[PDB]
Amino acid sequence: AYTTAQLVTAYTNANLGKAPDAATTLTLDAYATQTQTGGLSDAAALTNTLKLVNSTTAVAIQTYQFFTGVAPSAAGLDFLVDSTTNTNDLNDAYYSKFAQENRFINFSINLATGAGAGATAFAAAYTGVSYAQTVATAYDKIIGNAVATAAGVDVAAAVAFLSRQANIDYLTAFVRANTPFTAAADIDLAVKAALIGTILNAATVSGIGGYATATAAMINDLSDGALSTDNAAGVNLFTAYP
Amino acid sequence: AYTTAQLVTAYTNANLGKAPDAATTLTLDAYATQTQTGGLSDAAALTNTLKLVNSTTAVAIQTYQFFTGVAPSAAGLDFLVDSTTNTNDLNDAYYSKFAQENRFINFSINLATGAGAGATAFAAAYTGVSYAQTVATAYDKIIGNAVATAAGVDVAAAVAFLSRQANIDYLTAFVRANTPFTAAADIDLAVKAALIGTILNAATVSGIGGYATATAAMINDLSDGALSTDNAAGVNLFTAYP
Amino acid sequence: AYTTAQLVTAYTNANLGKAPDAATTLTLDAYATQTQTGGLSDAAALTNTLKLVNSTTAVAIQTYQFFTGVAPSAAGLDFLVDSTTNTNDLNDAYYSKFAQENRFINFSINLATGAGAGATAFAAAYTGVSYAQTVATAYDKIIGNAVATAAGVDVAAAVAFLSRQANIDYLTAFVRANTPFTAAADIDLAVKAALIGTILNAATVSGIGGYATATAAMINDLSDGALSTDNAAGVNLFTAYP
Amino acid sequence: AYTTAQLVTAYTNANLGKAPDAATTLTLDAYATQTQTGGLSDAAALTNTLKLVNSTTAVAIQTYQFFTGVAPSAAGLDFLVDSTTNTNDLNDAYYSKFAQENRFINFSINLATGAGAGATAFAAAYTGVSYAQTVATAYDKIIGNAVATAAGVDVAAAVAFLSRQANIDYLTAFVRANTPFTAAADIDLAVKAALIGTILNAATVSGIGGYATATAAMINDLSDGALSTDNAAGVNLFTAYP
Amino acid sequence: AYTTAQLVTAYTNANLGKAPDAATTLTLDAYATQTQTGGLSDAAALTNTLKLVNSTTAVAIQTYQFFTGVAPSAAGLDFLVDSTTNTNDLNDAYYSKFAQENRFINFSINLATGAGAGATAFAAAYTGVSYAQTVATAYDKIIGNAVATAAGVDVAAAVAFLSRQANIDYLTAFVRANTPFTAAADIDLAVKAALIGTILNAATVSGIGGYATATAAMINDLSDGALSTDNAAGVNLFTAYP
Amino acid sequence: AYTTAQLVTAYTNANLGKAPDAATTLTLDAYATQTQTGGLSDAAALTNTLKLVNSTTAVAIQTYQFFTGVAPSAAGLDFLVDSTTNTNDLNDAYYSKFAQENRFINFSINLATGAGAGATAFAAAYTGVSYAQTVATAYDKIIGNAVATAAGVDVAAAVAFLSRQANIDYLTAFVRANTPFTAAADIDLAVKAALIGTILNAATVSGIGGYATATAAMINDLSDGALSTDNAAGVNLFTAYP
Ligand SMILES: CC(=O)N[C@H]1[C@H](O)[C@H](O)[C@@H](O[C@@H]2[C@H](O)[C@H](O[C@@H]3[C@H](O)[C@@H](O[C@@H]4[C@H](O)[C@@H](O[C@@H]5[C@H](O)[C@H](O[C@@H]6[C@H](O)[C@@H](O)O[C@H](C)[C@H]6NC(C)=O)O[C@H](CO)[C@H]5O)O[C@H](C)[C@H]4NC(C)=O)O[C@H](C)[C@H]3NC(C)=O)O[C@H](CO)[C@H]2O)O[C@@H]1C
Ligand SMILES: CC(=O)N[C@H]1[C@H](O)[C@H](O)[C@@H](O[C@@H]2[C@H](O)[C@H](O[C@@H]3[C@H](O)[C@@H](O[C@@H]4[C@H](O)[C@@H](O[C@@H]5[C@H](O)[C@H](O[C@@H]6[C@H](O)[C@@H](O)O[C@H](C)[C@H]6NC(C)=O)O[C@H](CO)[C@H]5O)O[C@H](C)[C@H]4NC(C)=O)O[C@H](C)[C@H]3NC(C)=O)O[C@H](CO)[C@H]2O)O[C@@H]1C
Ligand SMILES: CC(=O)N[C@H]1[C@H](O)[C@H](O)[C@@H](O[C@@H]2[C@H](O)[C@H](O[C@@H]3[C@H](O)[C@@H](O[C@@H]4[C@H](O)[C@@H](O[C@@H]5[C@H](O)[C@H](O[C@@H]6[C@H](O)[C@@H](O)O[C@H](C)[C@H]6NC(C)=O)O[C@H](CO)[C@H]5O)O[C@H](C)[C@H]4NC(C)=O)O[C@H](C)[C@H]3NC(C)=O)O[C@H](CO)[C@H]2O)O[C@@H]1C
Ligand SMILES: CC(=O)N[C@H]1[C@H](O)[C@H](O)[C@@H](O[C@@H]2[C@H](O)[C@H](O[C@@H]3[C@H](O)[C@@H](O[C@@H]4[C@H](O)[C@@H](O[C@@H]5[C@H](O)[C@H](O[C@@H]6[C@H](O)[C@@H](O)O[C@H](C)[C@H]6NC(C)=O)O[C@H](CO)[C@H]5O)O[C@H](C)[C@H]4NC(C)=O)O[C@H](C)[C@H]3NC(C)=O)O[C@H](CO)[C@H]2O)O[C@@H]1C
Ligand SMILES: CC(=O)N[C@H]1[C@H](O)[C@H](O)[C@@H](O[C@@H]2[C@H](O)[C@H](O[C@@H]3[C@H](O)[C@@H](O[C@@H]4[C@H](O)[C@@H](O[C@@H]5[C@H](O)[C@H](O[C@@H]6[C@H](O)[C@@H](O)O[C@H](C)[C@H]6NC(C)=O)O[C@H](CO)[C@H]5O)O[C@H](C)[C@H]4NC(C)=O)O[C@H](C)[C@H]3NC(C)=O)O[C@H](CO)[C@H]2O)O[C@@H]1C
Ligand SMILES: CC(=O)N[C@H]1[C@H](O)[C@H](O)[C@@H](O[C@@H]2[C@H](O)[C@H](O[C@@H]3[C@H](O)[C@@H](O[C@@H]4[C@H](O)[C@@H](O[C@@H]5[C@H](O)[C@H](O[C@@H]6[C@H](O)[C@@H](O)O[C@H](C)[C@H]6NC(C)=O)O[C@H](CO)[C@H]5O)O[C@H](C)[C@H]4NC(C)=O)O[C@H](C)[C@H]3NC(C)=O)O[C@H](CO)[C@H]2O)O[C@@H]1C
Ligand SMILES: CC(=O)N[C@H]1[C@H](O)[C@H](O)[C@@H](O[C@@H]2[C@H](O)[C@H](O[C@@H]3[C@H](O)[C@@H](O[C@@H]4[C@H](O)[C@@H](O[C@@H]5[C@H](O)[C@H](O[C@@H]6[C@H](O)[C@@H](O)O[C@H](C)[C@H]6NC(C)=O)O[C@H](CO)[C@H]5O)O[C@H](C)[C@H]4NC(C)=O)O[C@H](C)[C@H]3NC(C)=O)O[C@H](CO)[C@H]2O)O[C@@H]1C
Ligand SMILES: [Ca+2]
Ligand SMILES: [Ca+2]
Ligand SMILES: [Ca+2]
Ligand SMILES: [Ca+2]
Ligand SMILES: [Ca+2]
Ligand SMILES: [Ca+2]
Ligand SMILES: [Ca+2]
Ligand SMILES: [Ca+2]
Ligand SMILES: [Ca+2]
Ligand SMILES: [Ca+2]
Ligand SMILES: [Ca+2]
Ligand SMILES: [Ca+2]
Ligand SMILES: [Ca+2]
Ligand SMILES: [Ca+2]
Ligand SMILES: [Ca+2]
Ligand SMILES: [Ca+2]
Ligand SMILES: [Ca+2]
Ligand SMILES: [Ca+2]
């Protein structure tokens, strides 16, 4: 049985010191009532509670792991999500106008293009590759073909939907109108990051794939208040939480 | 085997001293015959007998528990349902023109708006929340998403039906024409109580959810004549009947 | 193996001394042949043999039990069905123009209206009750909601069919044109008896319900020639044959 | 393994000394080959061999059993089917123009009307009975309602088909144009025999019912050459072959 | 594992010294490869290898067995299929223009009409029999009604298809234009042989029936090079290979 | 768990010293990630890794085995796929314009026509055989009728599709416009090689058949770097890898 005070504290640690909104408080309150009435197990309530921090914390963990090869530390997560020194962070008015999918795309573009840490690695490996191939390889890397088929979703339809011309046209307009890029090569590279960022958003929403499971464990690890690993140079998701 | 005299006495205690109507007497008489003919078990007949007091007793128990956080005592139930000092109570001519759903809405509006005990708590928590969010959170709090899916009903369709624009338009007309409220904020808060009151009526009619099960046990506890707990400050449903 | 002589004697005792008709004799003869050829068990043949006395004996037993609260005795059954002192009885030319359903309605009207034994009790309990409620309560009392659903028949459709406006219009015309009643209250009470009488006919035709099972046992008890209980003041079906 | 010589001898005894036709010889020869090739068991071949004598021997056995109450003896069967003293018998040119169904009707009319042995018994029992009732009772007596439903055939459809107005119109034309009867009562009685005769033909063709099973055993008993019972006054099928 | 040299030698013995054609050699070569790759068992390859000799050897065995009552010997098979003294045999240019079905019909006509060994027996038994009866009896004799139903094919449809007016019109044209017969009786008898010959072709193509199984064993017996029985007066298929 | 360095080395040995392309590197990288995240077993990743060398290595192994009767050695594979002395090999700019199916056809034409090693054997066996027969025999030889049916694919539809007139018209145009052949016999022989080459491409794409399984084992054997057999005169696939 979870009290509403316990759930909001777990959410606060997962959200890194940010108090829940009034609407989210009612959702957390509903979860607490279900546990007391025998309608929801203790483990299920916590997982649902930690599922509300997807747009604010899971975006920071997953984008760094794919691009920079390592997830940010507790101090790095604190700076990115909710910090006093960072005026523009994930849960402030600067990002308040974005959705979950747009937030994933923004970090993907920033990391792979310009002054991002993984920008040089992204350009070397993702050059000379078509849009369809990038989607196909990223989908297998993030979610996986075997795992997705076992879960029930159709891989062939999902890959085609993500690589449709409508998605490409919208993303290239998003890159050109927003990013300070105008060359064909620079725009082409940035669209690839946007395509990958969409896949990352799809994986965390559905919860299927190695990336989605790994970031869930890290959020659960951070839920109690202190990260168990908390490595200074970053936490490798795949080896910290096998 | 239940005699018709036993069933009406159980109903009278559940209805708090009110004699059954002539139509309800035939329904109770039919239940007694089925038990004697081996067509209905003793436990099933009593549960069906206590299912006829939904509009007169279960409304008082459930509305107080959700809003004030505690169910009324035996003396409090007596005053609300059938008392000599209370000229206008649930089973008199004042409420004789209402249906089951309208009765649930009336207590919800009275408790959450004006001089209700839980009015101050309701305003603090349910401010800045949209209509769709209030329905979604209340449905999970009262009935529950996991329990409803297991029972067979579709949660997604049920929530959309309860939050349709037709329901909102009818409820806001009900609030404005009946309640002494004219400000946008006051009307908006009252409609939220009406939306929650509809959910409470849905839960007790279908019998799915923690609230429906809890109020059934309290009515069964009151059926014999004396409430087992009968706390002076109120009976907490979720801890008295786990 | 049942001989045709044995079957007609069992039918005669069930019909209370009335010899079977020529058409019914062939039906009884067919049952005897099936037992000798190994196509029908001994118990099944007797039950089918006793199923042909529904319109002449089961009508007397069931109507008295529902209205007067007790089934007629062996002497009472003899007077009602086939007696020398009673010029107008069930199996004579006076009732030869009626069907099974009409026979059930006639006793229901006679008992509940006028000089019937149960007329005073029927008026006290069945006053202020709508037609739909009377059908719903009688159907549960006679057949039962749980038993009917288990058997496979749809209760919701059956109740609506029995309470349709076409049935009410036919029955009120039957009451007004036949019974010596013209007041609204007297006609309304008589139609309720007709509605109940139709339900009794439905129960005995289909064989589902406590009433149908109980009257079958009494007919089987009377089949051998002498009733086992044969109480002077009447036989209570539900306690004599649990 | 049955040789073609053995099969024709079994058929000859079943047909009471009549040699098989050239077409029937090929059918018997085909049965013999199947047994030698392992495609048909010995018991199945004999039953199929004895199924070809339906129109010549099973008609004599079944009609007498239903009407006269006893099957003909071996000498009686010999006179009826194939005898030197009887110029007009079942397997001669006199009956060579009839089919299986017409042969059954002819004996039914002869036995129940005119100088038949069972004519007086048939008139006493089958007077005052409608056509539909006669078909319904005869079908239960010969085939049976329970047995037919278990086999898979629909009793309700079969009875209605046998009692259709087209069947009655054809049969009454058959009776009037052929039998020397013109009165309404005499024609009505003869049509009842024709209706029963059709049922007997249906039972032996399909092989369902006590009559069909009983006459099959008697033919099998006669197959070896000598009847085991061979009672002088007739063989009662239901007690000789339980 | 079968080598391509072994398969062609088995086919040569089955074909009685005739070397396989170039097209058939590839088919035999494909069977050998499948056994070496673990895609086909040794027994299955030999049965498929012996299934290619249907039009040249199984025609001689089956037609003699049905008509003359005995299959030809090894010397008789050698003369009929592939012999130096016989200029016109089954696998030469004389029969190179015929198909499998036409080859079966040719032997049936030759044996049952003219100077055939079984011509006198065929005329005595198959006189006075209609076309439909001949097809029905031959189908039961060759394939069998019980065996065909167990295999899954519909006997009623198959018999009607083989006895359709289109088949009769084609066969009677085949008989009249080819055979030196012009009388009605002679043509009628020859068409019956053609109808039976078609059934024999159907049985060996599908592989269902006692005849098809028996001739397969004899071909398998001849496959090694020397027939095990090799009776001088002929081999009776049904007793040599039970 | 496979590292991306291990997968590319396995692919390099399978591709015989050729470094993977940038697009293929991402595919190999995705396989490595899945193994580390527990979404793909070690054996499955290697098989998928070796499935990307179908167009460059499996074409050399399979075409030689079918036509020349033996697969090329490690030195022979090195010369054909990736060698310094061979300016025009499978993975250079000379073959960079072809697809997988066209590559299979090219070797089939070269080997069976002109100066190919198996040209003389192909002409001797595949002369006087129709197009439909060649497809039917090759399909059974390469994939097999029994194996294909067990896998689920329809053999009858597949053979008809491969032998359709549209396929023949395209292939004969391919032969005439490309190969230096103009005679009817030479073109006819070359089209047969093209038809077989298409079947080989179909077998390796679907992975069904003895040829597909055998060439997979040889590629797996070559994956570690050194071939286990490495016979100087060639490796017989069916006996080296049973
Ligand atoms: C392992 C670990 O724990 N490491 C930590 C360290 O130990 C240490 O504690 C600390 O570090 C930080 C961190 O590494 C930081 O990384 C940044 C960061 O990931 C990210 O930052 C953003 C960037 O500085 C910048 O913004 C603009 C802006 O997004 C703009 O986009 C427009 C615009 O918003 C408006 O017009 O709306 C449009 C729709 C929008 N367009 C799009 C496409 O979205 O776009 C431009 C061009 O893309 C972009 O430059 O400002 C943001 C506010 C900022 N975000 C946050 C949350 O702060 O990406 C950087 C590339 C990345 N830098 C490097 C280097 O990798 O870097 C600082 C140093 O600069 C470091 O101290 O934290 C570690 C995690
Ligand atoms: C724990 C426990 O056991 N406690 C008990 C105590 O120990 C003690 O024994 C005792 O207490 C009572 C009780 O707490 C009472 O609580 C009241 C009560 O819940 C409720 O009361 C109603 C209210 O006083 C009032 O009415 C009007 C009216 O409903 C009107 O609505 C119109 C109108 O009917 C007509 O026009 O038709 C329209 C369709 C209708 N509109 C709508 C929208 O329905 O609407 C106005 C505005 O909403 C409303 O004020 O009169 C009712 C007759 C009355 N109902 C009953 C059953 O009595 O709500 C009050 C807000 C609530 N008060 C407080 C405070 O919470 O309060 C009294 C003291 O006043 C107390 O003694 O019982 C405890 C249970
Ligand atoms: C426990 C036990 O065993 N008790 C027995 C006693 O110990 C004792 O042995 C003995 O008793 C009898 C019995 O109690 C009797 O009961 C009667 C009886 O149940 C019933 O009787 C009928 C009634 O007297 C009457 O008839 C008319 C008539 O039905 C008429 O209807 C018209 C008409 O037929 C024509 O126009 O066609 C129309 C279509 C039709 N209309 C309708 C609607 O059908 O309608 C009027 C008004 O309804 C009606 O009065 O005459 C009938 C012939 C008679 N039936 C039989 C079978 O006899 O109902 C009585 C109300 C009931 N009486 C009492 C009192 O309850 O009563 C006598 C004394 O009168 C008693 O000796 O048997 C016990 C079973
Ligand atoms: C256990 C359960 O749940 N059962 C239910 C079923 O599962 C099902 O859901 C529904 O099914 C029904 C049910 O089986 C039913 O049966 C009918 C019914 O019993 C009755 O129905 C009445 C009838 O159609 C009709 O009657 C007239 C009338 O009897 C008339 O007689 C006159 C008249 O009384 C007066 O003038 O006096 C005269 C002397 C008299 N003449 C006589 C007696 O000769 O005679 C005519 C024929 O000439 C007759 O049509 O109309 C009534 C309104 C109707 N009543 C109701 C309540 O509907 O009798 C039918 C013979 C009977 N049918 C069959 C078949 O048995 O059947 C329907 C058929 O669709 C079925 O759907 O409900 C169950 C409760
Ligand atoms: C127990 C036992 O074993 N008993 C045996 C005895 O011990 C003893 O061995 C011995 O007995 C016989 C037997 O009992 C016989 O029984 C006969 C017999 O069952 C049957 O006989 C037929 C009857 O005599 C008669 O014919 C005409 C004819 O059918 C005609 O019909 C016309 C006509 O054919 C033409 O116009 O075509 C029309 C389409 C056709 N119409 C129809 C409707 O079909 O119709 C008339 C009127 O119906 C009819 O009389 O002649 C037949 C040739 C004959 N059939 C045979 C097979 O012989 O029915 C008799 C009524 C019955 N008699 C008695 C008595 O029951 O009787 C003799 C004595 O007469 C007896 O020796 O065998 C015992 C079995
Ligand atoms: C048990 C055993 O092993 N016995 C063997 C012996 O021990 C001994 O070793 C030896 O015997 C042979 C064998 O018994 C032979 O039997 C023959 C044989 O079965 C068969 O022979 C055919 C017949 O002689 C004949 O031909 C014509 C021709 O078919 C013609 O048809 C035309 C024509 O082809 C053209 O116009 O095209 C048309 C489409 C075609 N029409 C049709 C309808 O097809 O039709 C006429 C009339 O039907 C026909 O006579 O010539 C054939 C070439 C020949 N076939 C072969 C394969 O040789 O049928 C004979 C009736 C049969 N004879 C007897 C007798 O039964 O007989 C010789 C002696 O003549 C004997 O030495 O082999 C035993 C098996
Ligand atoms: C068991 C083992 O390991 N053996 C090895 C040896 O031990 C030894 O190590 C070594 O041997 C080689 C090898 O045996 C070689 O075999 C060749 C080879 O299989 C193949 O070679 C091709 C051929 O020489 C040739 O080309 C043209 C060309 O393809 C042309 O096609 C046109 C053209 O490309 C353009 O116009 O586009 C068109 C679309 C196209 N048309 C079509 C239809 O595709 O077509 C003509 C006519 O078909 C053709 O001649 O040149 C190619 C570049 C070459 N391919 C490669 C990969 O090198 O087929 C030869 C017939 C075969 N030779 C013999 C002999 O069998 O032979 C050399 C000696 O010449 C030997 O040293 O390797 C062993 C495996
Ligand atoms: Ca913080
Ligand atoms: Ca901040
Ligand atoms: Ca932790
Ligand atoms: Ca009270
Ligand atoms: Ca009151
Ligand atoms: Ca209690
Ligand atoms: Ca009597
Ligand atoms: Ca009387
Ligand atoms: Ca008794
Ligand atoms: Ca005889
Ligand atoms: Ca005779
Ligand atoms: Ca016997
Ligand atoms: Ca030879
Ligand atoms: Ca020859
Ligand atoms: Ca052998
Ligand atoms: Ca190399
Ligand atoms: Ca090269
Ligand atoms: Ca190796």
Author numbering:
A (entry chain F), B (entry chain A), C (entry chain B), D (entry chain C), E (entry chain D), F (entry chain E): 2 to 243
What does the paper say about this structure?
We also applied our approach to thin cellular appendages of C. crescentus bacteria known as stalks, which have previously been imaged using cryo-ET. The cell body and cell stalks of C. crescentus cells are covered by a nearly hexagonal, paracrystalline array known as the surface layer (S-layer). Next, we defined a mask around the central pore of the S-layer, corresponding to the inner domain bound to LPS, to perform focused refinements. Further 3D classification without alignments identified a subset of 42,990 subtomograms that gave a 3.5 Å resolution reconstruction of the inner S-layer. Furthermore, divalent metal ions, known to be tightly bound to the inner S-layer, are resolved. The size and shape of this density agree with the structure of the LPS O-antigen, illustrating how improved subtomogram averaging in RELION-4.0 can help uncover new biology.
Whereas existing subtomogram averaging approaches are based on 3D data models, we propose to optimise a regularised likelihood target that approximates a function of the 2D experimental images. We illustrate for three applications that our approaches allow structure determination from cryo-ET data to resolutions sufficient for de novo atomic modelling.
